[PDB]
Amino acid sequence: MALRFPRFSQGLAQDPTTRRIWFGIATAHDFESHDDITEERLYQNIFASHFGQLAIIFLWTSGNLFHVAWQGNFETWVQDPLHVRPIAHAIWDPHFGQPAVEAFTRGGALGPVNIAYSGVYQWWYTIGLRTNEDLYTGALFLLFLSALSLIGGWLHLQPKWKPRVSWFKNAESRLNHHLSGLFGVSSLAWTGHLVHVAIPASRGEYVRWNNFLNVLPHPQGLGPLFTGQWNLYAQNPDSSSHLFGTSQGSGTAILTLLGGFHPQTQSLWLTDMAHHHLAIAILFLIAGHMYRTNFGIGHSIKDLLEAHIPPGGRLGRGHKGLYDTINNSIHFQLGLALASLGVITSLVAQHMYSLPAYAFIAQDFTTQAALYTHHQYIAGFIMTGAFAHGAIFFIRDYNPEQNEDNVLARMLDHKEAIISHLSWASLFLGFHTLGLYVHNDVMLAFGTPEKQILIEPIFAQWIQSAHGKTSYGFDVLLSSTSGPAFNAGRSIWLPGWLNAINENSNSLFLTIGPGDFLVHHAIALGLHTTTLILVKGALDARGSKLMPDKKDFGYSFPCDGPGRGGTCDISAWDAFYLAVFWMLNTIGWVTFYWHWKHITLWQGNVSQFNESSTYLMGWLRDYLWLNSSQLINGYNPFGMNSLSVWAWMFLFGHLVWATGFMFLISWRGYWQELIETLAWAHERTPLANLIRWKDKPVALSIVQARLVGLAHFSVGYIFTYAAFLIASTSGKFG
Amino acid sequence: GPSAQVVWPIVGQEILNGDVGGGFRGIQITSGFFQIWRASGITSELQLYCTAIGALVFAALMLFAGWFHYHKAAPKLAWFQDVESMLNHHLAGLLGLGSLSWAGHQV
Amino acid sequence: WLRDFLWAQASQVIQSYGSSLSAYGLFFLGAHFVWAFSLMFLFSGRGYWQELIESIVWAHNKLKVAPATQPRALSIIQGRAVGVTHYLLGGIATTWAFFLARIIAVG
Amino acid sequence: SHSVKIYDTCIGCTQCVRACPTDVLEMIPWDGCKAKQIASAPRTEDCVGCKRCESACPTDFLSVRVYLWHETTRSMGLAY
Amino acid sequence: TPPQLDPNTPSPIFAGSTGGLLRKAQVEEFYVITWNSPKEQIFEMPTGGAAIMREGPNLLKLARKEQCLALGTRLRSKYKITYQFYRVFPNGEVQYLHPKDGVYPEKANPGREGVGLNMRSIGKNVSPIEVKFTGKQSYDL
Amino acid sequence: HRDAIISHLNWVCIFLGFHSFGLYIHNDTMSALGRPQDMFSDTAIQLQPVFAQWIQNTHALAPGVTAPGETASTSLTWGGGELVAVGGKVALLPIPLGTADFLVHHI
Amino acid sequence: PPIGPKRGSKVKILRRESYWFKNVGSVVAVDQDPKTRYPVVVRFAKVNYANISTNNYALDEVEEVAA
Amino acid sequence: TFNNLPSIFVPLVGLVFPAIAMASLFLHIQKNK
């Protein structure tokens, strides 16, 4: 195809400069823009790449399992879990000094080790997996699955098995199989695990592969299921005294719907999760048999979209022609996919802390913070990518003549209204949230905290009171005993749910206040503003009044010159790039709120947050300055402690967060005219005229340098906050 | 504490008037002007008041001088381009006699 | 520097919000803001803001409140100027609040 | 290297050529405007991409139009 | 028109600068500009500094085309002399570059052809979906 | 020769950034790895400002031999048994110059 | 017969790629040559981003407003 | 010799494999068919 390293692009291969290297790294996975590309070859490369990603996922999980099996104290952790530290992996750093080996020796280890703040200990212990040989077996099996995915990705690149373009565009059979099998049979099989293994493992006996065909998950065994007497699977719910991992207080039920938490572990019941995965398995197996594949029954998604045109034309032509703008467009598919994935990742984060599924994962506090922060930053990034790929769809894959007047072209018909009302909502939220925060800053400054504007969140307290939280006296559907909701569920799950939510110590529907109102509106500002930037870049991806031919310039291009006033950062890529800043800000707000509310809950002084979260010097003093003491003292002149690595990573994240400012503030032109002097000096320095570059050393490109600054910025954001949130939450542990 | 600013008691900002000392509630300044005034031997608010009126007089004088030297009688380029005189005067007269008269004040 | 200087000496500016130095507390955070407010200008470019402004101009044309002084995003050089201006202001005012609160509350 | 394509909305004002610092553009005879000339672009291989041609094009959006493309040593403004 | 056939004419009086031909002349093309100055005078050359061009023919070898044409526009606008520059590859084959018809490119000389010219308004270009999976772009139909 | 100017200045900037801030980073790494014997400090690898210390030694002894008209040194930042306290406050004892002062002066 | 609008007729623009899209303008002059592709010179009250208040438009890229 | 295995692999992945990959990918970067 080409000659030099970007073999996929003969435009960068025919680039004498160093831009070749960078852009060939960056555009390597943009198969749509490569030379000699076809839709068939694009789809096949995507399929093989998905196989490679699955292989790397299984390899990374096998690595986790191996390093907990080899270097972990997991066999000791399953004895006294809430008073023994997890161990992620060992450490062999030949730069370590002897004090750092004395300090990083934790968890009763033969040497220095790292504390698993990821929760794999709790999750593996909850699903069975007691001894280290079980984790070894799991790592072997996931190595096997990695090799299997690599085999599949190589096999589906050969001509005898290269699938056709019309096979990846079978958008009915794929939904049918993925709902029925990938979502339903997989949830059914996880119920099979939770019933044959994890529930017996929680109740003592260790049902493993050698003895699972001759033990009964329920003492009757498939009589209740086939005879329909399913209540027999909810007979002995191991009520209120069960010790996880031992048969004391255990039971026989496997699918009892109890609601609420275990008393000991403060996690959900494995019977609850078994029944859950069973229920959604039935629902997904039912929902699978919907789309017509080969058998003369089912729906055609075309004639569902084509048929959903409202009379009166309030939408216009409706979804007439939208099957073709998604089936033939992989960027629409990717945008919708990442939208759903970001929504459910945020949901994972928001439910795993308040409804923790793993044993003794609510008791280790650093794990919950790391997990919530992880999944929320992942969700914000995935959401930013959903929108970026919607913009890339509007540029690369959108055909206006195919979808005239439909529900998607009507976006661009009135994109100014969407953008301007998002620009109203975000502007309102910021003006008023910041005005109230600054009012409270000044009131606390002037020594009159009684003059604060502490707007109670009545509308969330009312929802909490609609769930059984008897902390506000609203007497709503589940806080009121005389109601239809507290009658049709008072016999099934509301006992456990009420006794869990009313507990002030867990994370289930925390008692909120005016600081929670104010920070929720900061969160709304962040979501609305990131949405504004992204939607504005997506709808102005095809063009605007300042650059109506933007679609001809692609997604990522630097600018349109200084003319017409100035067109810096006009691309949809640039909108994405600014929205990553606003996204990281938004998730920093949501996670600062989470971590301070939770560290104040875990410490005990919820009053600290309730009186200090309403003014920003409370966030700077009582959260950032206060909780960062044990962090920045990770290495002092007279010694160090186990938080030395988190202090170093804190400062490292500061350093790269600041280095991104070099690429964001300082732009090109200064650097090309610097490297011209450097090239002069190298070509005129004796004993270095001998050495000459092969790639002409140009400065970084513009859009590239926005990316590089954003990468340094985000790496520093993430590393800084990870260090602070783990060090502060591990320096004291509640 | 050196204090030469008092705030008005309107929206609770009166707490910025701190116990700086001396039966006075105000903002502790940091310009070191009190130290200059002790180096000048002021020792009275009447003297500060009259030199404030004098500095207002000089502000009006400089404003009138700018008006005069633009709008009424302005130099031309032969006046600025000569710099031997500008340096001679700014050395002997501005900085020379300025330091001389300050030494006279001090002495 | 992060611990024994920035974290340690910036206790008097945050255990302010009380007696006189509350303004220095306030001017801490606001300065912390404006610096960051500058980062809206240095990182970004005129094109995005002109397109946002043209959407808002559509929203204004739809209410007969279109201005005659056509709203244009700041010049590129003016975006950089506003950025470096707010950056210097916020950083320097942060340092000023920090310095003055610390040293008036300890010496 | 780059791709400086122009469009028929050109009025023959000769300002893009008079702004071009690399002689990419040149006015040719034409019959589509009052000035009876239009701005061709033969030396696109000499285009740096500075877009002075379209910062001087007095049309509703643009007539001369620079599409940035494969960057060579002439298009990367390199004296070395 | 026939090109002007670059001779070995003299050069300006210049004391040397760090703005010359480093390696883009050794292995790649470098450029050369010739102008007839009626009198000897000083001029700011584009490689930094100030040279004194001689009377009659002058010749200055520069590293890229932008230096040559910047100097040429400054000559034609300030000293009103007629410049014309070339491009000399390191094996030879001096290429006549600037006017290409004898008359400057702002004048509509006949003979030069329409290349890089779309007979459509700028917003009638098809979308990228039309030219997807094709080597052509949205501005080459 | 402006390119020689900017090239050598870029070089000495890189050299200075390294052999000051990289000294700080080495100190951070060593103190975080539990190797304070390998830091750049007075209790470690010493980078003492010999030249500034020598100037302090001279100017502490200057008024006795080189400037006999002065009964005491021009300043007390040099050295000696001089600590001009006016109350419960120091007012400029002799400022010492250690490894950290070398590091930050090179910063 | 003079083609197009008149030298003072008010007109609006149907050109998608223009700054003054769906915005009215005043026809300065119409080139009567049937070889110029964009004869209708329009004058607008408000400048575009290039600080320009006029452009030549086509006959079908224009619509004689009824006001 | 299982507490010695980190000492084998941490250099072999962290010093040796990076040298291998950097050299090989630098050759792949500068190749010309």
Ligand code: CLA
């Ligand atoms: C029933 C049969 C079946 C099954 C099982 C699959 C399975 C799969 N297909 Mg599909 N496929 C099928 C039929 C089927 N296919 C048919 C008939 C066609 C032709 C029309 C295709 C065409 C097709 C294409 C074109 C592609 C796939 C891909 C994939 C993979 C999806 C990637 C992945 O891991 O998602 C995993 C996601 C889930 C299991 C969903 C989980 C989401 C929940 C809601 C999250 C929350 C719960 C969470 C799991 C709990 C975590 C806790 C803890 C365990 C961590 C997966 C292996 C893609 C791939 O990767 O290729 C290799 C791909 O590119 N398939």
Ligand code: CLA
């Ligand atoms: C602290 C820093 C900061 C602040 C305050 C803002 C503020 C804003 N950004 Mg963001 N932004 C930032 C950093 C910041 N940004 C960074 C670092 C980047 C990356 C480049 C971006 C990227 C970005 C994009 C890409 C977008 C925004 C948008 C917005 C606006 C969102 C609406 C809103 O909340 O308005 C409410 C108003 C405020 C929060 C302004 C605060 C100032 C007060 C309220 C005004 C009065 C002060 C005072 C009385 C004036 C007197 C001073 C002087 C005259 C003497 C708003 C102006 C969006 C936008 O403008 O559309 C609406 C948008 O699309 N910003």
Ligand code: CLA
């Ligand atoms: C902390 C943030 C940060 C950092 C590290 C840098 C770093 C640098 N800047 Mg930048 N800059 C920044 C922010 C930053 N800048 C911002 C925010 C702006 C806004 C306007 C600028 C604007 C700017 C301009 C305008 C200029 C610089 C210049 C420089 C360089 C001078 C110092 C040097 O090279 O010495 C050595 C390098 C350093 C001191 C950087 C830190 C590296 C440390 C010491 C350790 C290295 C470890 C080692 C290599 C191991 C690496 C790991 C291994 C796995 C490979 C250097 C590349 C100048 C330049 O490039 O010319 C000399 C210059 O002219 N910068």
Ligand code: CLA
């Ligand atoms: C000079 C500073 C320095 C350096 C060089 C190291 C070096 C190391 N440390 Mg660290 N450490 C330091 C300071 C330092 N330490 C300090 C001050 C502390 C605080 C006390 C720690 C705390 C610490 C802990 C707690 C741990 C380490 C570990 C390690 C080892 C990582 C294993 C490895 O190479 O995996 C391979 C390395 C990586 C995967 C990371 C590189 C990621 C790259 C940049 C991104 C990918 C880029 C791209 C895809 C590939 C391009 C390259 C390609 C050509 C191959 C390594 C020897 C770990 C260890 O020994 O476990 C085995 C560990 O657990 N260190």
Ligand SMILES: CC1=C(/C=C/C(C)=C/C=C/C(C)=C/C=C/C=C(C)/C=C/C=C(C)/C=C/C2=C(C)CCCC2(C)C)C(C)(C)CCC1
């Ligand atoms: C740009 C674009 C794109 C992308 C976009 C995006 C990214 C979006 C996102 C979006 C999202 C991200 C969304 C979300 C949403 C959500 C919702 C809409 C919700 C709803 C809810 C409801 C309805 C609820 C209900 C309930 C409750 C309340 C609770 C309980 C239960 C119940 C059920 C009752 C695409 C590709 C598409 C295309 C192109 C353009």
Ligand SMILES: CC1=C(/C=C/C(C)=C/C=C/C(C)=C/C=C/C=C(C)/C=C/C=C(C)/C=C/C2=C(C)CCCC2(C)C)C(C)(C)CCC1
């Ligand atoms: C503070 C101030 C003020 C005031 C000030 C003052 C008051 C000043 C004064 C000043 C003065 C009051 C001055 C004086 C001067 C003088 C002089 C400078 C002199 C000189 C002399 C000489 C030089 C001499 C010479 C001689 C001799 C030696 C002897 C005899 C002879 C003869 C004469 C020749 C005011 C209000 C403005 C305001 C601002 C601030």
Ligand SMILES: CC1=C(C/C=C(\C)CCC[C@H](C)CCC[C@H](C)CCCC(C)C)C(=O)c2ccccc2C1=O
């Ligand atoms: C510092 C800086 C430079 C100088 C950047 C140079 C030319 C490139 C970086 C120098 C070397 C190559 C450091 C490489 C550092 C990493 C080790 C590379 C990681 C890449 C691997 C993962 C492949 C620019 O060229 C620039 C251009 C446009 C806007 C802003 C800037 C800008 O801020």
Ligand SMILES: CC1=C(C/C=C(\C)CCC[C@H](C)CCC[C@H](C)CCCC(C)C)C(=O)c2ccccc2C1=O
């Ligand atoms: C935020 C931002 C803008 C938008 C900033 C606006 C357009 C300038 C702020 C203008 C103020 C808000 C106008 C209102 C003041 C008027 C005098 C009206 C007074 C009447 C009442 C409001 C009191 C840019 O144009 C820009 C350009 C280039 C790089 C970065 C940026 C950038 O970051």
Ligand code: SF4
């Ligand atoms: S493109 Fe610009 S310079 Fe060329 S003829 Fe048209 S208006 Fe004149």
Ligand code: SF4
């Ligand atoms: S971008 Fe610059 S070099 Fe290219 S045609 Fe336009 S004016 Fe000429």
